[PDB]
């Protein structure tokens, strides 16, 4: 066990973190690494079995990801001596120090800059999706990105926002159980912004935002009509007027057109046709990035745990364990 030091901003960390202040996160100089650091201070983790579970939920997904294009685990740990005391999760990664919206602002990007950024995207989402992962959340906020131009995926709804403009439609709107394409989406809205400085579909709420989308792609057919198990939804839907997908070349002018086709790929309306991340990888457009032997996929994962109902105690008592036994990378 090593020593801890207290400060107010109150966080208590090992005093090989140094130097910390706010970003609840904080940036810090890791000592022993050398590494600039974010710091996130879980407060009040076990508060309900829901916050307990999602504590438990984090420090596992957290835990198992050990990829260049993924956030993972440089450090855990509890001020905390026993159980008993146990009360605060600290987590520790790589800090890159800015979002990706944070770097369509700063400069302005080639197709180049778009190739390398959306190509570590699916490179990390290939891995995230091959332990049965979905991230369901992928925005240009949760991407983290240093001077470099490297490229980390973290974390994991009212009106003109943000927070809804990269949603697949089947998801911001309840329309079936969906699969991981929905990522696939989501890099499909940020691609598109990337290579246009613009929002893809910025709604005003959920049914303009809907309405853009469908401008865009089409309205369903018949056979997607039937894959959408909201019979509310469905009945929506079919009020609206009939309309064709659009001509991307039209929409994206002067892109590279091999980006005008994965973005074809990337937009269709119904999740069960998407290109996967695996695919869009081997795609002509990362021609120069691709290396199949350079973009491996993850260890199993065992989420067997979220079927699981427990109580608080056994929840925390989870997260505990997977504290202590957490290895560093090295
Ligand atoms: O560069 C970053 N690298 C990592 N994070 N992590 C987090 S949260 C987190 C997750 C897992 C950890 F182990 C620890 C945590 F703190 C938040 C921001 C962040 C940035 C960052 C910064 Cl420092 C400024 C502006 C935008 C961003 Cl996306
Ligand atoms: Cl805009």
Redesign the pocket.
């Known amino acids: 066990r090593p020593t801890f030091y207290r400060q107010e901003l109150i966080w208590e960390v090992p005093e090989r973190y140094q130097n910390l202040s706010p ?1 609840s ?1 904080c ?1 810090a100089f890791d000592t022993k690494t050398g590494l600039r650091v ?3 201070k879980l407060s009040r983790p076990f508060q309900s079995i829901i916050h307990a579970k999602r504590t438990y939920r984090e420090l596992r997904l ?1 835990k198992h990801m050990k990829h260049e294009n993924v ?1 993972g ?1 440089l450090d855990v740990f509890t001020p905390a001596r026993s159980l008993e005391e146990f009360n605060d999760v600290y ?9 990706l919206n ?1 770097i369509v602002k700063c400069q302005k990007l080639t197709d180049d800059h778009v190739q390398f950024l959306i190509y570590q995207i699916l490179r990390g989402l290939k891995y995230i999706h091959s332990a049965d992962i979905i991230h369901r959340d992928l925005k240009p906020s949760n991407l ?1 990105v240093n001077e470099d131009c490297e490229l980390k995926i ?1 974390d994991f709804m009212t009106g003109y926002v943000a927070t809804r403009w990269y949603r697949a439609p089947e998801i911001m709107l309840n329309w079936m159980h969906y699969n991981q394409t929905v990522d696939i989406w989501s890099v499909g809205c940020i691609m598109a912004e990337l290579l246009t400085g613009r929002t893809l579909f910025p709604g005003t709420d959920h049914i303009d935002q809907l309405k853009l989308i469908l401008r865009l792609v089409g309205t369903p057919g018949a056979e997607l009509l039937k894959k959408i198990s909201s019979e509310s939804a469905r009945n929506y839907i079919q009020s609206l007027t009939q309309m064709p997908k659009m001509n991307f070349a039209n929409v994206f002018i002067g892109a590279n057109p091999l980006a005008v086709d994965l973005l074809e790929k990337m937009l269709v309306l119904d999740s069960d046709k998407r290109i996967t991340a695996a695919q869009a990888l081997a795609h002509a457009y990362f021609a120069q990035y691709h290396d199949p032997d350079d973009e491996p996929v993850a260890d199993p994962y065992d989420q067997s745990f979220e079927s699981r109902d427990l109580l608080i105690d056994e929840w925390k008592s989870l997260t505990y364990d997977e504290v202590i036994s957490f290895v560093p990378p090295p």
Do not use: E, F, P
């Not at 987590?91 to 979002?99: E, N, P, S």
């Open positions: 970003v996160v940036a974010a710091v996130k957290l956030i685990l987590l520790v990664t790589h800090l890159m120090g800015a979002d944070n983290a973290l």
